[PDB]
């Protein structure tokens, strides 16, 4: 049967630890995949820790990280969360250098952009096996997600990205029903840029805090109803979640255009809590070190910057990265609401480190009714490697 | 229950990729077998990737390639598509240094020849376990196709080989249910060769593109009916697509008897889209690099040489190999025709390099209402190895 | 279904070997995690072998061993009883350096207490999913078990210490139904203390005999009813059997308080037989060395030193530590009455040994009708390993 | 629902190849265990390979081979036939240094025996989990099959031997039901002598080809009827079929006592074939070398030795060793007979090779209807390995 993602997002007073792979660790020993965006996404019967990989392993020579992001040998795999992402209790997934991932309650659909920069492709996925075709209709890297999709009573959506980096490119909401595409809609942002989406169902519909590579520190929002009508902007919130990014005191926040003067960004997530907000970022405002959670009060709505609770889950001295928000269904957690999670990237090598390869672990939390004090779940490796 | 593979083969107007293994990348360092023929057939509920093994890891001294093709080692082995032929994933299937496989809707039905080459038996298991057997009727390498078989409505066939390489072979073509041989066929082809058949279902019936290792450039063809009663020539199309094979202008179609002097080749397929056809090929006319796929206008039934369409999947600076057609069962694709899909041998190591070791990777590609772009999903393995 | 462990203790004359792992020898070149405490518990279709890592592998320099016990590292993984701890087989459970687990029918509830020392949390996960939480009450390591915890007709049970591990510490109770806690309960305890309690369904109560690490060589002991109303003390039997401990003859037993000046101590278990106690403990009586299992007639009621059988597990010139009790469910064994198993922790490495690691690995024994010969299921591994 | 093993053996007229593990080759860089006696058994479902292990790895100084057979670390453990015996694919079985195992078509029944030499205990377990127990009824080293036991609808049986390896021993039949012993049998059997009996179903009744290890060169034999009651003495066949052993001209066959002054012996395996008979043997009368397989006309019947049919299914050039009985369930092979089917054990390393480790390789054939050609399919593995 289909899954009931209609239920509102569970109102929570913290995070506590879901699960950690060590991957890294793990891998200066074991058959480990050099791997890259370890989002998560659950069925109604497990959740699974997807990923990229190269085919190479942590400490073999494949593992060379001079091999382009999107080259011809990237492919999307999976295990179950806290799992690493060996070799052995892998699954594949598709060919891909950007993926997304969500299961509708009866299979799992996946999606893997692969092909060419100029006329890329992106091929989906359902039941283990390709159903339908999207290719680059703006020929300049089409890309998605790297975090969970979105199923909501059958029909599944997610964002998708074509053009520029930096100006204005150009972004796309898609849906399906088993790995069948059903309808698209694209995106007017104009002067604003929408990347990496992070999305999650709540009261039937599909929100999602996504990048802006371009100009903004603050993190585009857009929410998506069921027959592709929607809105967007940012996250009213008047503290900035991105990175790189200014000082909390030196911003100004904007629910309608980006603020800040930064370019660049990192893929981040945040949970719509009635009107309040958890948002994730980096605790460095320069660079992917470390990981907090703070709570705004009616930051969803309002340009607010009442922080009525902080979280740290990763400590400033050591590497974070990538982070994306997922849910647990309700057939899962017993619950009658959907518990937010979210899950941490933590990258490890090049370029911060003295390696000639460069790979992540992840640490991944859910939801819960209770104030959970701070702590480091950090990688763990030792680094360098035997190399 | 019985899987109708009564539909027609879906018209499709290029070919997504479905997975890579990279099998050889992750034998770097990974405990994975030193393949062969990594062919792909599905069940109703998976497709998986069969292979022939030494019993052999990259790596290793045993992978020492001086091994005859023909051992006492040789057997079939499997895992789902895109996995890499590793030793902890794999399952076991027959003894064999030459087979094929398919399912019929319940069990899987594999098929081992192994023992002497003058008087070779080939196995046949159904459901995990030995069922019937077929000793060589011409005592000279009895032989089969090295990709899926075909079954429809519970009845599989598939086509074997016993004789010379080189002059004259003689050539069947076996029917059974339940691992059971119910129904056998000689084929008359005088003058005409036919070895490594791909075959498919396709309107009630099988049809198989073959190779012609005596005297044709161009591939052999014979549509098989349920009664065992045939069609056999080649495919009509007036271009060359084995390999060696000369260039395509200096080429004659003929849907009879075979066109070039050359007499090598090597395994490929075809795809019957109504009268146009889908033919697979190296780039190369001399060498197994590369590989492309056009699709002739009326190829299937005229001395055509209209190509409609040229799809590009490995490129020609990279090693390629054997070739082989599967079909999507209904049950996974959710479509009221039969997905074509083919997967693409890459050959690494001896002769063409300088290594110890021969083995292949593999990529898969399906049907696909849609123009795919050309690129390269080749192999990527550096070489040498550690040796 | 819940699985109704309402049944008494299964009378047993002795206990015959149920698996051993070889853990350890095995790693010396296989994937295997270091581990600690491989505590059993069933679910009504198989037994599992859960253990901490530090997500090392033997013979990787990440064993290096100097990482704290409760690190940031270590997580609560599993596989079948007998099976190694390896990586490719394992399954993740929750982020611990404390746990729990037992299933009540339909799914496992697992118990990961991880987080900083002043302010640790314990996880509950219920199918593989978080479910509920508990923060630390008094501050102070807040810890359970180490072993099977105990569901009775739906609702699962077990022990956690929060406090120093000298003077006076807090112990609660807490029940659970779907991994959700209906009710807890304060132990007053007042002189006495309780960590790592091995418990065990009998006559619908959860029985535990713990260990007492203040000043107690006799173990402490306390029934639980079902709605969390308690009794609580020390095994009666006049013989001590916590390690370090004192000589038997200068031992006099008590049900009430702790007897000998001992402080340290290590975790064990004990059994119910009626009125009798099957006890374990080391052979040495000063370091954790060899394991037998004596019973001791009306030792659970009275100040017994009666020794009516002594079976030896582990001989004393090979290293032992910790050991835990389970039970065998109904559905399992075929039988009216539950098989009352242990399991025994053989500790390898530092500090006894001169490796710069420390892991250890397990032998299990169930009940049984008859009397079983003395011998000694040691590890085995021959150390040191290439380090 | 249990399996009803009621039907004759069919009729076979030659062996074709079941499976090859190739697990040495494959150890010489996977992980793969050290192991002896790789029987097979066969569920409703699938047929796996059970063996025993030391818990050490092939390349590991822990298969130093110089650890007793009857060590503290022998366990019994399984993969699926075909499969090696590796770490990763591996389930867990019982504790022993000899075993035996059946299925009665719902569940797995093993029976592992370990311990003491003059006290050993052979626990019996049911659907992964003891049951019931034997001690040593003799004092002696109690052992069994070290191949498939027997299931007759819903009761399973097996042979045991207790006492010395020259003299008279003593020999008992089990009968058990779900894991639990519900009968047993004393052999009178003076001057004779019963190890590692090789047994199969046929006409309702339980057949068994064993070693005489006392005096005879031909293999002793008796068939249990349900009740327990027997009949047992020798293969009538005039030809010697256990290794070392004389020629065959210079044997005179005997249904009654054993011939030949040979006194050790080697596991074999025989089937009736209504009067006529499968018998195994090494091909070399002095070493473990080579394997063909006879069939004598009315050799079960009579002392004859009309040859009516020889495979060979390893050439004398390479090594050989133990070879075991087993049956091909009805729900799998689909026949209205039951199959008969043999492994043949080939072991490498010590003594006749110069490696400081011993293991052993496997093959398995099963009836077929038809003559199969003669062949060897030997293990493969180069000696030494990296030690
Ligand atoms: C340890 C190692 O192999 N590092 C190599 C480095 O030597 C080389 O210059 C570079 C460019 O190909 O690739 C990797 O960085
Ligand atoms: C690296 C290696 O072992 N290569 C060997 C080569 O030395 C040898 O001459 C040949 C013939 O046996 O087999 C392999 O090619
Ligand atoms: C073999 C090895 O790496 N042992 C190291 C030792 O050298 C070092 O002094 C200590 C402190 O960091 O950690 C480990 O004991
Ligand atoms: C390569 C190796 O470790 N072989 C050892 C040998 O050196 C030793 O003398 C013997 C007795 O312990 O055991 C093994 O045979
Ligand atoms: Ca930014
Ligand atoms: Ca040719
Ligand atoms: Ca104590
Ligand atoms: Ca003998």
Same mark, same amino acid.
């Given at each position: 049967?289909?899954?009931?993602?209609?239920?509102?997002?569970?109102?929570?007073?913290?995070?506590?630890?879901?699960?950690?792979?060590?991957?890294?660790?793990?891998? $200066?020993?074991?058959?480990?995949?050099?791997?890259?965006?370890?989002?998560?996404?659950?069925?109604?019967?497990?959740?699974?820790?997807?990923?990229?990989?190269?085919?190479?392993?942590?400490?073999?020579?494949?593992?060379?990280?001079?091999?382009?992001?999107? $080259?011809?040998?990237?492919?999307?795999?999976?295990?179950?969360?806290?799992?690493?992402?060996?070799?052995?209790?892998?699954?594949?997934?598709?060919?891909?250098?950007?993926?997304?991932?969500?299961?509708?309650?009866?299979?799992?659909?996946?999606?893997?952009?692969?092909?060419?920069?100029?006329?890329?492709?992106?091929?989906?996925?359902?039941?283990?096996?390709?159903?339908?075709?999207?290719?680059?209709?703006?020929?300049?890297?089409?890309?998605?997600?790297?975090?969970?999709?979105?199923?909501?009573?059958?029909?599944?959506?997610?964002?998708?990205?074509?053009?520029?980096?930096?100006?204005?490119?150009?972004?796309?909401?898609?849906?399906?029903?088993?790995?069948?595409?059903?309808?698209?809609?694209?995106?007017?942002?104009?002067?604003?840029?929408?990347?990496?989406?992070?999305?999650?169902?709540?009261?039937?519909?599909?929100?999602?805090?996504?990048?802006?590579?371009?100009?903004?520190?603050?993190?585009?929002?857009?929410?998506?109803?069921?027959?592709?009508?929607?809105?967007?902007?940012?996250?009213?919130?008047?503290?900035?979640?991105?990175?790189?990014?200014?000082?909390?005191?030196?911003?100004?926040?904007?629910?309608?255009?980006?603020?800040?003067?930064?370019?660049?960004?990192?893929?981040?997530?945040?949970?719509?809590?009635?009107?309040?907000?958890?948002?994730?970022?980096?605790?460095?405002?320069?660079?992917?070190?470390?990981?907090?959670?703070?709570?705004?009060?009616?930051?969803?709505?309002?340009?607010?910057?009442?922080?009525?609770?902080?979280?740290?889950?990763?400590?400033?001295?050591?590497?974070?990265?990538?982070?994306? $928000?997922?849910?647990?269904?309700?057939?899962?957690?017993?619950?009658?609401?959907?518990?937010?999670?979210?899950?941490?990237?933590?990258?490890?090598?090049?370029?911060?480190?003295?390696?000639?390869?460069?790979?992540?672990?992840?640490?991944?939390?859910?939801?819960?009714?209770?104030?959970?004090?701070?702590?480091?779940?950090?990688?763990?490796?030792?680094?360098?490697?035997?190399?």
């Amino acid at each position: 049967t289909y899954m009931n993602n209609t239920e509102a997002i569970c109102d929570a007073k913290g995070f506590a630890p879901f699960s950690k792979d060590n991957g890294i660790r793990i891998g $200066s020993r074991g058959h480990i995949f050099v791997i890259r965006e370890p989002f998560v996404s659950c069925s109604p019967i497990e959740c699974r820790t997807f990923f990229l990989t190269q085919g190479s392993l942590l400490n073999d020579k494949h593992s060379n990280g001079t091999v382009k992001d999107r $080259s011809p040998f990237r492919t999307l795999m999976s295990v179950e969360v806290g799992q690493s992402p060996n070799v052995y209790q892998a699954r594949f997934e598709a060919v891909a250098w950007s993926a997304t991932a969500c299961h509708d309650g009866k299979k799992w659909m996946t999606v893997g952009v692969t092909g060419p920069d100029s006329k890329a492709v992106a091929v989906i996925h359902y039941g283990g096996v390709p159903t339908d075709v999207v290719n680059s209709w703006a020929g300049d890297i089409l890309r998605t997600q790297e975090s969970s999709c979105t199923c909501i009573q059958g029909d599944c959506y997610w964002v998708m990205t074509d053009g520029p980096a930096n100006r204005q490119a150009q972004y796309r909401i898609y849906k399906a029903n088993q790995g069948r595409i059903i309808g698209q809609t694209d995106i007017s942002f104009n002067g604003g840029h929408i990347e990496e989406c992070s999305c999650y169902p709540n009261d039937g519909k599909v929100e999602c805090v996504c990048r802006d590579g371009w100009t903004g520190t603050n993190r585009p929002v857009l929410v998506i109803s069921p027959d592709l009508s929607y809105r967007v902007g940012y996250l009213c919130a008047g503290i900035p979640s991105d990175t790189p990014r200014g000082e909390d005191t030196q911003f100004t926040g904007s629910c309608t255009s980006p603020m800040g003067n930064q370019g660049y960004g990192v893929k981040g997530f945040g949970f719509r809590q009635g009107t309040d907000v958890w948002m994730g970022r980096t605790i460095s405002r320069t660079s992917r070190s470390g990981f907090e959670i703070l709570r705004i009060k009616n930051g969803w709505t309002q340009t607010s910057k009442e922080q009525i609770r902080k979280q740290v889950v990763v400590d400033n001295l050591n590497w974070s990265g990538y982070s994306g $928000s997922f849910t647990l269904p309700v057939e899962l957690s017993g619950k009658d609401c959907l518990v937010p999670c979210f899950w941490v990237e933590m990258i490890r090598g090049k370029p911060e480190e003295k390696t000639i390869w460069t790979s992540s672990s992840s640490i991944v939390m859910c939801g819960v009714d209770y104030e959970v004090a701070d702590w480091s779940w950090h990688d763990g490796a030792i680094l360098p490697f035997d190399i």
